[PDB]
Amino acid sequence: ESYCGPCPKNWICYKNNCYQFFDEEKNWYESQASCMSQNASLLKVYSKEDQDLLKLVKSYHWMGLVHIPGSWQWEDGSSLSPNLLTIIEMQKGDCALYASSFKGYIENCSTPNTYICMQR
Amino acid sequence: LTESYCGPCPKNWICYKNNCYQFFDEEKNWYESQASCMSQNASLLKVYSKEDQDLLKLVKSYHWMGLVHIPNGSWQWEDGSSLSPNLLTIIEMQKGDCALYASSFKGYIENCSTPNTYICMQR
């Protein structure tokens, strides 16, 4: 038994990270702007153990993984850790969707998708 | 934004507005599902508030919850309390006395002996 968070009330708390799903279809840029307005970022995947709840996520949703032409990187500038995501090519694009279990789909940044914000 | 602590909950359970949830994909009939939650200081999902449990809009598939029909004809939770109105739309699927949760805020009537996935909730 432990106290989780802190997180805002309308967010799921899991191992002290906070997650919120947004059902609005938005492109990657608009989804990142949405998360920032909540004092958050798009989903960052850093650990299969600390984030094992991501195995239960259904459907595909924007996360904060982008390609600047260099490897894939998160919004915060950190590199994607190895052996964490299986990356699959889906569309011509520089952004990625999260899909269970621990997959990233390369996706056109302009394609509207639902999205997951994260705070910690 | 206002930061709150959530819980307390076991570390491997989801916390949402201080309730803790766990999903179980190993299928069990209703009673065995209840026994499994009990062994984890929990009960099957109890639905009491659209606002406090709005995360249930996102819970798909069909999972046992702790809702049973007593043939005084009442609908009750495992803890003995009543199903409150304006919370769930209840639909028959199989003749039975137990209910599966489905999105959004639906319950499907199901034979209590049918194996299904289930949701535990700390209580």
Ligand SMILES: CN(C)C(=O)[C@@H](NC(=O)c1cnccc1-c1ccc(C(F)(F)F)cc1)c1cccc(C(F)(F)F)c1
């Ligand atoms: C039985 N079951 C496992 C479901 O139905 C799952 N539903 C969806 O993932 C789900 C289904 N439609 C739309 C969105 C989601 C979704 C997306 C992101 C998250 C977030 F913000 F968490 F990232 C949460 C849900 C599920 C339901 C509740 C909680 C969780 C969990 F938090 F554990 F991931 C998963």
